[PDB]
Design a binder for these strands. Sequence first.
DNA 1: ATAACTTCGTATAGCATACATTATACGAACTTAT
DNA 2: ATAAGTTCGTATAATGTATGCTATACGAAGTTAT
DNA 3: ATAACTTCGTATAGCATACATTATACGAACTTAT
DNA 4: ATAAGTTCGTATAATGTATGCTATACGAAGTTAT
Lengths: 140, 139, 140, 140
Amino acid sequence: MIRYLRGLVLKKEAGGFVLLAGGVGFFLQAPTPFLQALEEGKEVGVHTHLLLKEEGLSLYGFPDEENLALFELLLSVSGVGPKVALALLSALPPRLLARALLEGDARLLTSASGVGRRLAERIALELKGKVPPHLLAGEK
Amino acid sequence: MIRYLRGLVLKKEAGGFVLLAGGVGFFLQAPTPFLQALEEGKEVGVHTHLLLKEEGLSLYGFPDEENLALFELLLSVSGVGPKVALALLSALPPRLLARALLEGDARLLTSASGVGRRLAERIALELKGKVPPHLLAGE
Amino acid sequence: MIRYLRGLVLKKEAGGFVLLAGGVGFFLQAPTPFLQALEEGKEVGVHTHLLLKEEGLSLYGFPDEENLALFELLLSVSGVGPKVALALLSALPPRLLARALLEGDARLLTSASGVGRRLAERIALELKGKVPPHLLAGEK
Amino acid sequence: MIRYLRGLVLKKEAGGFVLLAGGVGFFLQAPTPFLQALEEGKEVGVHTHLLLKEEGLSLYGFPDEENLALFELLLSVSGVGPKVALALLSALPPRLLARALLEGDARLLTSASGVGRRLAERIALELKGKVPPHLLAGEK
DNA sequence: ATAACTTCGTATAGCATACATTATACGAACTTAT
DNA sequence: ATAAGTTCGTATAATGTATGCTATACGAAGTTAT
DNA sequence: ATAACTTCGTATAGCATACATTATACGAACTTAT
DNA sequence: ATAAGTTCGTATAATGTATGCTATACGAAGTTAT
């Protein structure tokens, strides 16, 4: 339904984050690691998904560029509840998406501050070595 | 999903009002003293939460950068009408700033009226400990 | 939530029309005497009321100049838009409600054709008689 | 509710594409001949019915000149299994309207393929006066 | 005892689509002037 | 008795909806000769 | 003559509670001044 | 010896089987010179 909304924001919350278009303001919670950066700007480039029933409407969050690969890999739709799907994903340590990734897939669902999800062979092949180019740093 | 609309109002209704914006015409139900102080000459910073119940699909309003999360007090099984669905303020004690809502935990809002319920263990925990710069004024 | 739509309209259909407010196009079904003459000419001040149904969702775009009292009077919790408040104006097409009301509020809403709507419409005496409106003609 | 969307498109995907000119980014799934190498105009205009449910969170699109009658004629039972209906399954083969459904208003939907049952009496009334002479080649 | 206050109590709200489209151009029988 | 209105209760047409079978790479029959 | 040349179509598992599994911050366990 | 002290063990996020029904005009009590 919704992908890659841009909005506007100048605010950060410990468990929250919002997007403004000027007249309406969207609320989107992004994965915990990268919220320490990527706060101020005219665009945050967030992918979305949402629940439709029983008073639970709230857009989800994911990093800039394109990272729905993360959501597809870590959906866990089998009755996990909204308390997890919004934020508790990074089983990987991507700190800049170009510094710790592509290191022989050891930092690609192999060994990190996670639980050992025991899944691979899909994102790694799809990666096609696009990690290095022009991502050596982040953004404010 | 939606939070912190903005704009200016031109109409006043006993049940609520509407917000002037591009596209659709946004409908907003807000507490009674808030709407009286929020005329066309005051900017309408509604911090909606969109409490939806079938036909009751409408936004809501609150004083700008204040009094938000009244849902923590007004959580209920089913809101029969707007008069319980966040169109309050006729009742709870403080007015014109919600300054007496905490008052440094000196007075609690539960026993000031017969419509509230005993929630002393939850009223105290609020940003009041940070001593916000809100003080008596025309706000 | 939505009350006062504004946007672009250029089409006339036997079941209704469409409204373009940029980005999306809203589908609106005006009452029978309204759309039969008033279709296009500017960003029309067509009002709004949403509906819930199992086999159809749309808008109902009531006439301009604050005529939503019509839907408010004719709506029931068990009613359906295509069959209620939109099919209750045939055999009674007042060309202009301001003309039919000015100094004739009681007459038009009391002694007109029909024997069913009056029981509820008796409230509508005071709704429109506020100020002299600029409804001397239509639009095309 | 929503009909005749329009916005910014720059991406081609095997399932569909996105539309994010203003506010959210709408996900659009065009039919097979359109999706087969019709992409990236200035702005694209697509119809829909907004058949959005809990499991399926996508909305569909169709050629930029009318053709919601195509969805009306293509309406199929949307089962649990994917790749059914979803704006796909275009029985007609045409490269474009004027290219391969001209020469009368019956040839467009007579003896096309498969079943081969004529259904002109329902559809021939709409595009007969607008298909020629434009729309001879695809838009890049 | 009662007029004119002041003060305390009380102070909104009707309807079942118990499968989801209340219908536009014909025949029968009149009625007049054919 | 029928030519020509007139009226009304006759009365639309197949519409179009609501928890689970589709894409793909393999055998193979038959080609052509004797 | 055997071998060498057209056509050629089809082999992803889990649906049946939708409410118990996970970031942190106290603590026993270490070195050395009898 | 040993207390303190190093580094790994500890610990929190729903009510769906569910939905129909508290609501601001004026009724009633009390004092004085009517």
